[PDB]
Ligand binder design. Structure first.
Ligand SMILES: Nc1ncnc2c1ncn2[C@@H]1O[C@H](COP(=O)(O)OP(=O)(O)O)[C@@H](O)[C@H]1O
Ligand SMILES: [Mg+2]
Length: 814
């Protein structure tokens, strides 16, 4: 069953309004009106603000093609609007003509919302009922006519490959569009163009209230409607007020950040930090006239770069013991912070009690707690505008959010916990005033508060766009740069040109910006295309487990930590783990395998090993989980046979250092440097940045006997000069195969091969032709795997694919 048809089953049904199903669903609506289950959920529904709007919203939808629906979080948009449309069609006898699709930002929301809406209809979710969901490679499909289907933006985008006009869908609901994810922004533009050819299509955009008229304006100033809600007053507290209220004092207990840990500072951030440090002395001074000396003493020493989870843990304990009843909701960045805080509470006997319910974001999150019991919900930033818990009275805003950024003049992109915007801070405050006067505790000081950005920039202006560029080409939307300029917030052309060029250097696009076979496969991997290249060749070459380890560390971070004052010995342990590999990436592999078998020897051995080698197990654990997700993507794309990164059949080459390094090269090219001849400092030539240095954290920073002239890297940083963060020595035959254009030059001395014209080394002419040939043979192998992809069988020795792949493997081991 071919890849372009996996989850197509709902879309490919034909919309035919059978007049007896029309009557059957009408007969069923009033039969439901007698089931106590249904009337009981109908009671909860009528107390939502959206219910009061019901027949005003359906009339707006019924009368216009494109509609924007505005409303505070919790008013009913996600769960009620699809129901309002189907029930209006059902009651009017037209119920079968109605095939509603509602898109969701995350796989989890598509499932949860479908199950909730189905519960509100006294039905099972899927299984031929009114409501269901479609995720990539997972389905609970509703009936074919008069149905609501919740899905992900990826599903729609894949659907467009099979039916660019989505002809069988009567209504499409774009939910949570204010989040401004890349895919949802591309979808909006594709749907706008589709309205011209689909006079019958209905399109409903659903947004939180801030900036919801921007979406109206983008759609030709289409009708807009706002579901009103009431918010009770919320007392806000800054870090000063919190520290004063609980007399916070930091506790009886420090590893290195920033440049040592691979963190570049963006210069647009540097301008506002200059305004912060310039205003800081006057702000402290005024604080000392209104807060206690100990409050200010503590405040001027708080770290701005990580949420103080110990402060949050203290504040929660103050709330539970000093404030009236009400659930508490915490907004943290990332699951690393959520589990740390959960364990901070759960280690204390006071919170092990039946009078507390502490939920990291779970069956019982919405259910109101008995008057004794206190609910504490620890959630990521995702619950700002998408999950609503009615019980909440106290909101703790950690003040931070995770967001990728892209540095266009140095082409380095990274992810970090940044300060929330004023808009986020106000949405978080609102969540506390939904049922009674609330309290919102903001974990930033007053000066920081005044210097927040008003809104977070859309992803389209911060992400790197390589993955998006592939999507545009796979949907045959035209010229990449031209199409992107039509988005509601077009990216900068510098970011577009960098992204296209990187894709060409990845060999995902050719010189005419057209997809290669490799690029097609990279489009089916929901990761950055350079990471997709690594993990794909980890599957083809059967070195999956160490490759996925390396891919995860590059995607997230390495597991090494550098406690302040222990630099000399931390680097001592790192290079011990290097083991003659001359590779920061293999070093993580060695540390990771040592960790897996340290934890198998007993968990006191695990704690010892992470401690003698300076590894954060919390980092290791998330790396492990990323490996399984990478595998699942390879499973869905047909390159691997099992969701397990340790499958023996995918790991026959997982101990061959040469092969592993060729795969690292596949993912990191064109980040290549030539090692300078030695006979002092270690420096290397780059294509354009000149002669640069090795980062002091790298296991190669003072390495004097390399065995090849070439290394690949992932991160270059600029402080006073340029530094390569993590580098790996590789053979010229790695670059020759996975690199750019190959050219031969000859004279009396020397047959040289040149790669991208500047990577130059001595090799016979025969190897250049042989590599050009194997590249073509690999293209055909990937091309033939485009329809119904299936993993390479390395147990069939006489396989043509095995013959070609074994030739490539033979070449890189040269
Ligand atoms: N899985 C669920 N179980 C119980 N209640 C839910 C569930 N999902 C949502 N709700 C409740 O339904 C109400 C409407 O939520 P929703 O329609 O998702 O809001 P929004 O307008 O922000 O999209 C909220 O008060 C929420 O608490
Ligand atoms: Mg919603």
């Amino acid at each position: 069953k071919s890849y372009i048809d996996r989850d197509t089953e709902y879309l490919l049904q034909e919309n035919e309004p059978n007049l007896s199903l029309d009557q059957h669903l009408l007969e069923d609506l009033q039969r439901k009106k007698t089931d106590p289950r249904y009337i009981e959920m109908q009671r909860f529904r009528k107390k939502l603000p959206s219910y009061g709007m019901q027949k005003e919203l359906v009339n707006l939808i019924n009368n216009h093609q494109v509609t924007v629906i505005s409303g505070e979080t919790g008013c009913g948009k996600t769960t009620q609007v699809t129901q309002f449309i189907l029930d209006n069609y059902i009651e009017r006898g037209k119920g079968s003509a109605c095939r509603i699709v509602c898109t969701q930002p995350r796989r989890i929301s598509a499932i949860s919302v479908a199950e909730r809406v189905a519960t509100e209809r006294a039905e099972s979710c899927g299984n031929g009922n009114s409501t269901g969901y479609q995720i990539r490679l997972q389905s609970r499909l509703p009936r074919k006519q008069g149905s609501i289907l919740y899905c992900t933006t990826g599903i729609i985008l894949q659907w467009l490959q099979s039916d660019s006009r989505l002809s069988s869908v009567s209504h499409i609901v774009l939910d949570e569009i204010h989040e401004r994810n890349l895919q949802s922004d591309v979808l909006m533009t594709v749907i706008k163009d589709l309205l011209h050819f689909r006079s019958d299509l209905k399109v409903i955009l659903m947004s939180a209230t801030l900036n919801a008229e921007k979406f109206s304006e983008y759609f030709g100033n289409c009708p807009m409607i706002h579901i009103p809600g009431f918010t009770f007053p919320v007392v806000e507290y800054l870090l000063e007020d919190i520290i004063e209220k609980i007399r916070y004092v930091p506790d009886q207990k420090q590893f290195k950040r920033g440049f040592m840990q691979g963190h570049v500072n963006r210069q647009e951030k540097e301008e506002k930090e200059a305004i912060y440090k310039e205003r800081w002395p006057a702000y402290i001074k005024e604080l000392r006239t209104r807060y206690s000396a100990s409050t200010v003493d503590v405040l001027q020493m708080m770290d701005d770069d990580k949420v103080d989870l110990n402060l949050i843990a203290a504040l929660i304990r103050y709330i539970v013991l000093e404030e009236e009843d009400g659930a508490i909701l915490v907004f943290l960045p990332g699951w690393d912070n959520i589990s740390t805080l959960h364990d901070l509470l759960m280690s204390q006997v006071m919170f092990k009690s039946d009078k507390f319910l502490i939920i990291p974001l779970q069956t019982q999150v919405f259910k109101k707690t008995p008057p004794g019991v206190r609910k504490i919900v620890i959630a990521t930033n995702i619950a700002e505008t998408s999950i609503t818990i009615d019980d909440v009275v106290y909101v703790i805003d950690g003040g931070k959010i995770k967001e990728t950024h892209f540095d266009t003049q140095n082409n380095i992109s990274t992810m970090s916990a940044e300060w929330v915007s004023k808009a986020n801070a106000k949405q978080r405050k609102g969540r506390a005033g939904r049922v009674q006067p609330g309290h919102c505790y903001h974990l930033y000081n007053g000066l920081r508060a005044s210097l927040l950005d008003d809104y977070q920039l859309p992803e389209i202006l911060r992400t790197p766009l390589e993955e998006l560029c592939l999507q545009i080409k796979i949907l045959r939307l035209g010229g990449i740069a031209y199409f992107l300029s039509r988005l509601m917030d077009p990216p900068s052309n510098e970011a577009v040109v960098l992204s296209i060029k990187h894709l060409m250097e990845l060999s995902a696009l050719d010189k005419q910006e057209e997809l290669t076979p490799l690029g097609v496969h990279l489009a089916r991997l929901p990761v950055e295309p350079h990471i997709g290249k690594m993990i794909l060749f980890g599957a083809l070459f059967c070195c999956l487990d160490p490759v996925l380890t390396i891919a995860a560390s590059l995607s997230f971070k390495d597991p090494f930590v550098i406690p302040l004052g222990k630099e000399k010995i931390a680097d001592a342990r790192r290079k011990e783990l290097a083991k003659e590999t001359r590779s920061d990436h293999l070093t993580v592999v060695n540390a990771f395998e040592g960790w897996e078998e340290a934890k198998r020897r007993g968990f006191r051995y695990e704690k010892d090993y992470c401690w003698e080698y300076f590894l954060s197990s919390n980092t290791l654990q998330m790396l492990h989980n990323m490996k399984g997700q990478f595998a699942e993507h390879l499973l869905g794309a047909g390159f691997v046979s099992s969701r397990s990164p340790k499958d023996p059949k995918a790991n026959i080459n997982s101990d061959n250092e040469k092969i592993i390094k060729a795969v690292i090269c596949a993912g990191l090219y064109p980040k290549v440097a030539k090692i300078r001849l030695n006979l002092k400092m270690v420096k290397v030539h780059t294509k354009s940045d000149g002669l640069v240095s090795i980062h002091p954290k790298s296991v190669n920073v003072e390495q004097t006997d390399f065995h090849y002239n070439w290394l690949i890297y992932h991160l270059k940083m600029r402080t006073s000069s340029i530094y390569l963060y993590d580098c790996t020595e590789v053979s010229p035959y790695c670059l020759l195969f996975f690199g750019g254009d190959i050219s031969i030059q000859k004279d009396k001395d020397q047959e040289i091969i040149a790669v991208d014209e500047w990577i130059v080394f001595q090799s016979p002419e025969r190897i250049a032709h042989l590599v050009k040939g194997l590249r073509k043979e690999l293209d055909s192998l990937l091309q033939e795997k485009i329809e119904s992809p299936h993993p390479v069988d390395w147990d069939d020795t006489k396989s043509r694919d095995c013959a070609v792949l074994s030739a490539i493997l033979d070449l890189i081991k040269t």
